[PDB]
Design a protein around this ligand. Structure first.
Ligand SMILES: Nc1ncnc2c1ncn2[C@@H]1O[C@H](COP(=O)(O)OP(=O)(O)NP(=O)(O)O)[C@@H](O)[C@H]1O
Ligand SMILES: Nc1ncnc2c1ncn2[C@@H]1O[C@H](COP(=O)(O)OP(=O)(O)NP(=O)(O)O)[C@@H](O)[C@H]1O
Ligand SMILES: Nc1ncnc2c1ncn2[C@@H]1O[C@H](COP(=O)(O)OP(=O)(O)NP(=O)(O)O)[C@@H](O)[C@H]1O
Ligand SMILES: Nc1ncnc2c1ncn2[C@@H]1O[C@H](COP(=O)(O)OP(=O)(O)NP(=O)(O)O)[C@@H](O)[C@H]1O
Ligand SMILES: Nc1ncnc2c1ncn2[C@@H]1O[C@H](COP(=O)(O)OP(=O)(O)NP(=O)(O)O)[C@@H](O)[C@H]1O
Ligand SMILES: O=C(O)C(=O)C[C@H](O)[C@H](O)CO
Ligand SMILES: O=C(O)C(=O)C[C@H](O)[C@H](O)CO
Lengths: 311, 311, 311, 311, 311, 311
């Protein structure tokens, strides 16, 4: 398998319309979770991809495996854990801030949080080209964090999305220290991050300076996401910038995962950072126009159409 | 207040279409929870009713309070608890058994489960006519169980719906020991139960025999629910039976609570057991026709219309 | 035109779900009104049919005109009245009586109620085979009543559905005197009625007795609707009875209209009362399975299929 | 209570989709009416607020009462009137003008319009800090106008939103005389208006000039709404302007109400006009992003978040 | 692989409500086609199953492969055919016959119709335990019929559902002759059929006589479907009857495929005809309660629950 | 009749949500087809308009006729053809290009494609003011192409929208040869086209140059559509340009037809090209805001409101 990702796949319940949850009557279900979204993007760009994860022995767990399998993700290492349930979350859209979303989690002690070093086979990780994970997975439990540590130790190369969700951590200091410690211990082939997380991690928001400090920690490629201002990629003292496109925002949740999975799978295939980046911007632009995270993540050929035709 | 109920109110996510949850795309939100449903039925039959409960300091908790307030439930004693979240559940409908439902809970460690003896004021409880709770509240935590024991000690009179949900107990033996202990300790003015629960508690299913044993336990009035077969009420040496009505079933969830709160509230105001039973059946028939436990619970006058007009 | 009808066409808002209107969030719009439903049945049985009516100079009036035109009703004599609004109503379904509906009208002083003798042209009316109206049109205003009196004076033959809606009259006594007054004055080729109306009008229940007394009033054919118990047609010494079919009921509103239009138009084509009745029953049966009143009114040939195939 | 409002609360039926009503199949029900929307804004900014009004003895009236109660509006003086019906209206969205709405009323002779001096108690009114109403209530009937005259005579302070709806008046000249008559007679602590109304009332457009002429009429604070161009507040020699924010507009209906209730209640709490205005703009901005008028009216603290975070 | 099926998978567009298609506004998409439904039932009973088929190089073709893969069907032999499109059909529900459905096909010259002997690998068919197909596949083109002939020639054992759809054949004679010719050429381990098809094929409707005549053609097991009267299974001069259950019918489409695939996969596993049959009745009962064909097809363990609990 | 259009009207199945069709679950039905959309716009601007077309003897064909009849299109010459089916298509929205759509046709060999010279009566066509068709009708079959050639020979005046859909042609060379041949043969009073089509026909995109070449081909008035850039109209030595308006785009399908039928119908009645152009833009702006090609096409008076009020 080309890419192994470790994480907790989740069921998302997206409010049918904007406003505080107490006034929403209908909820539309999607399959999501940061690494799962990433994996969808990897397969859409024609690399094989496996999600190492746990789900509950329940309908929602089975929904995750079947969906993933439908979309071409290798599910052989998604373990069913009878001891706990499949984690979920709700999205409150556009309140109190228009065009922004807020997540309400029901994932404490979930099957997914029970991801552990025992799930990480040494031969299997070593046969892959790259291992990916995120700061969500580092947050969910000590054993999931240790699973990432073990996979990263065994990996040929690594990618990490910082993805700091302060609600998942006892403190920002803990987030900071946990993520910095991974960056300091391992070379990171592609780091995906943004000004918010980098302020926490490095006390830096400036893109060029971010690259300089992350490069000093052993990061080869920096993908620096700027939201509605676009994104920047850096490799070997070369910068590429691509501006965002103006579209109506339904739900931005998962836009960075579409970008990151697209960027990383194209980069792995030998595409330059300019092309990988423009495709990542294309992927993000499509996903935010709708409620789900990953259904509109384009294939490489569809993303090329987007870039050649969309103005 | 006339009636006090102790319980965990919950947000219900009702599948828009029947079938396994992994194939359901849309969920319709309702406010529910057994004793909440019970309280709705009480106020529909013109007694004041307070729910003693905890909710989270979240949208779903505000939902519960606002909905209760809208429906005329006294919400003075629904406490917002910042330490945890408002419990929720999903309804899977019509699979694997047509016209029945299954519940998937997200309530472990919830705010509602934090209901405790300190939430039970002696002067407030003594001030009421009757105190109601259920085996669900006895199951959700040790402190919620102790809160009911304390409310029952203080009460002028007591109703209990056995409501055994096997998923909420460590074993059926624990359910039996916990519920039997309450029955041996207290007089119960109205006990609401059914064959399934009575099999567990008494190792009998025969209605006459159930009444004989329950009566030895200090049960004055037995409401013995038979689902699509109707229900029987017993008092002293009177036995009243009424058949269920044939209606299309959307979701029978909450049917028992609609019957129980209707029955108890009418019984308390002097109505005989036949009248109370028939209004109970009428309430249950209406609610099972829709998604939603309690919106269709009829007022006294609407249940009379039903009984006079429907065949 | 073969058939002229006088009445008030209306916009119907059905509850998407059963229950008290205060809990209904969605309403589905349909085009209806008793004589409009009747006209749809007439054209489906391959006669030409004109509705004489008023609508407001508003969207809902244009809705009525266009929907009628789409369905092949001659709309030449539906007049736009800029002085008032198109009448509308809401349907509450299945509460407090399952499988039954209640109507909440917003029609007082509507354009439809402004139907008047001046809308009734002598030459136009004399050139049709039959003029139909209902006790609804007799109720809505003094001028609509007078419009029916005038059309009935000029007509070659008449039908009348008694259609007593107690909400539209100041008393049942007022309805009785107004409707008997029509019956006494004119010959009625087809009278459509039922036990409820007949009890008010003639203080009899028994169908055979009803026909004897109606015959004294100048009634040639009696269509006597019995709801879930079927219907009976009488002509001379022929009595025909047909049982209702068991179907899941969504909304019975307009069933009688589909029956009455179907019956009358077949009867006008020389079909005997047995055939006309069976077709009327087929028409009623189909329309009660769904929210709208007239979309499922069968053509002659479709009603024949239903009768041959459905048991 | 801190604030008393007089008006007609209404049931709103919004088109699920944009377009001429004749092509709309689905309508989504919301609870609204100008002074009701205003009351929701008042309570969200943590003052107590009572609506004095009538509703019909019908489902939609119960809907109004329960929704108001759910939202913490004091409903003690919303009277059930068995002699008429609860008024309602429809919203046509985005046709013929995108991002704008048109209202089609069914409210003539409604229970709400039967609001009258006899509903206005001297002691109750004198015991509040402020009485609010609008030019809508002045229009709906002679007695509702008189009810406002009486409440304004007894009040410690008053607010008035001019809210001229040309459909509710026999002429613009009638509106002008009726509303000037109020302004001439009473001191007005907060006047809410806009160029359209001010042009009718004072034959001026320029905001500075408007305030000079309004000040002669006894107006202390002027809130001057400019739609997509923002709003201006005036008090003494303070002028405050705030631009509108760019958001996708679903339905602007009730924006001014959310603004006016927010502004007035903050102003009554000793917030300066700058702060009150910015909060009113935040409230308007949120509610126009969705179908209903008042579900997204922010609390004080949520409006602070919006202001600090949204650009 | 245990079971190979040959057929044309199809996209189904199910009317959201009953009535003639011209009045239906919404269509709900499902993945279906007789053999695909069969394959879902086979995998739900824990045998491996492969669908040999073609789909278009289009979204609907990809929808078929992904859905099938999600549900555990081996899709390695579903070929994408760029020369044509994925076939679809619409279902008109409950008109002109309540509780019955009518299919409108758009499948002429489809990718699926291009199934040919060239798609049938000799080694692959010979490694399987059983090959299944239906009279639909025999109808769709000469080359699909020849594909079935070749697979049946190579198979260890065979199953056939007669599934005569007269719309797909030039005449009933052609259907009859084509199906009889297969029955005469091959032993058939399980034949699934009913009175309608057997009247065409044998001029027999009587179950016991049907068995006798089909046994004389080389059929080992006869599964004889009786709709709302249940179904009968015959093997070695033993009959098993199981009555149907009373449930509300949403859409019966695919009920026989659920039954047949369940029956055949359990029979293959050594279950007796009594058990295989009761499970087939369970599968059919669940699917007809909803719009899709195969989402509610139960697993073996869920079907056991159904049979033990549903009365 | 003033205007005759020749075409294939179609049933549209519009995805309820954006994205790849395999992820869409719900489809909303509309009546569409380019020349049908054109005719709607003609009658909205107060000319009589007949559509010459074939539909199937099926629900979808009856749909088309009834809808056209409802909207005031003369349907005397929409012929029901028992030999084939009514053509349909699906709209995939927002993927892979945001705010654009893609069409998937089910129309090969349709009834509409059977439009032929025999459907074109010489006296009927000569009797009209103008004849319209499009490159779609020229593509669907040889006989439909010949039907347009014949109608154009007979016509007093002609409009043509080039409407090149590459999927409907064997090659772009065939489109170019077929359309160029019509242009060289006939005077064209209004030609509607755009850069994409003009690139194919003339190997130019520059608007001024396009007009120069088209004018040599006997085009009197050129309508040159620029999508989100607006449109230009040319006549003699006048050039009128109007920008597009910024609105949220749901589906731009049919926008060109709304503009074309509006423009042509207004031009025919004496309006100058600026007025006709501006009303065209107004019509197109409205339709792109919803699913559905033609429901929001404005009347003359509504487009004036739009132009006077919208910014
Ligand atoms: N408002 C917007 N308008 C246009 N494009 C946007 C907008 N917001 C986000 N994007 C796109 O989203 C890309 C990545 O967004 P970003 O906020 O960095 O990821 P994120 O916060 O990681 N999302 P998530 O996956 O929930 O963690 C940007 O580079 C844009 O291409
Ligand atoms: N299939 C049915 N048909 C008609 N009435 C029914 C049916 N099922 C239940 N009821 C009615 O509901 C009443 C309560 O039955 P029951 O199903 O035992 O309660 P329950 O569902 O256990 N309630 P709950 O604990 O509140 O989820 C019965 O006495 C009937 O009046
Ligand atoms: N519950 C039902 N079940 C089956 N068929 C029914 C049912 N109700 C009505 N019908 C059929 O409808 C026919 C007409 O019924 P009826 O109740 O007299 O109409 P109605 O009251 O005049 N309806 P309306 O058109 O709204 O005035 C009956 O004779 C039956 O064929
Ligand atoms: N199109 C818009 N875009 C952004 N903000 C808007 C828009 N329209 C209104 N607003 C906001 O709403 C505020 C109030 O607008 P306004 O149009 O004066 O209300 P209104 O006409 O009184 N509405 P109503 O409550 O139905 O009477 C404005 O000052 C803006 O903050
Ligand atoms: N009205 C009904 N009520 C209850 N069960 C039914 C009803 N109709 C069908 N069934 C069930 O469906 C089973 C098989 O139905 P049947 O009509 O033989 O298959 P079919 O016509 O092949 N369906 P299809 O898959 O579209 O080809 C029966 O044995 C019943 O278990
Ligand atoms: O299981 C629970 O706790 C519930 O609250 C579910 C339902 O609301 C109720 O119990 C049905 O009786
Ligand atoms: O492509 C076609 O033939 C259509 O009819 C699609 C649209 O209705 C129309 O062409 C859009 O211009």
């Amino acid at each position: 398998v080309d890419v192994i990702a470790l994480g907790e796949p989740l069921i998302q319940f997206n409010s049918f319309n904007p406003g505080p949850l107490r006034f929403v009557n209908y909820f539309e279900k999607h399959v999501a979770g940061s690494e799962l979204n990433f994996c969808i993007a990897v397969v859409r760009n024609h690399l094989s991809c496996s999600l190492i994860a746990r789900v509950g022995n329940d309908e929602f767990g089975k929904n995750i495996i079947e969906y993933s399998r439908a979309q071409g993700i290798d599910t052989s290492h998604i373990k069913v854990d009878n001891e706990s349930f499949t984690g979920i979350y709700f999205i409150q859209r556009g309140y109190p801030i228009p065009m922004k979303s807020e997540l309400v989690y029901y994932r404490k002690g979930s099957a997914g949080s029970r991801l552990s070093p025992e799930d990480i086979n040494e031969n299997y990780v070593r046969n892959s080209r790259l291992v990916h994970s995120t700061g969500i997975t580092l947050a969910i439990s000590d054993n999931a964090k240790e699973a990432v540590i073990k996979a990263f130790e065994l990996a040929k190369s690594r990618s990490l999305d910082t993805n700091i969700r302060p609600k998942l951590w006892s403190s920002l200091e803990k987030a900071k220290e946990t993520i910095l410690s991974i960056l300091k211990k391992y070379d990171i082939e592609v780091l995906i991050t943004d000004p918010d997380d980098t302020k926490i991690l490095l006390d830096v928001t400036d893109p060029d300076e971010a690259y300089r400090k992350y490069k000093e920690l052993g990061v080869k490629v920096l993908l620096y996401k700027l939201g509605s201002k676009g994104a920047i990629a850096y490799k070997d003292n070369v910068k590429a910038f691509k501006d965002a496109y103006k579209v109506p925002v339904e739900d931005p949740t998962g836009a960075g995962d579409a970008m990151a999975g697209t960027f990383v799978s194209l980069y792995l295939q030998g595409k330059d950072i300019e092309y990988s980046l423009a495709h990542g911007i294309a992927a993000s632009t499509l996903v935010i126009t709708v409620r789900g995270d990953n259904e509109l993540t384009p294939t490489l050929e569809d993303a090329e159409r987007f870039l050649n035709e969309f103005k």
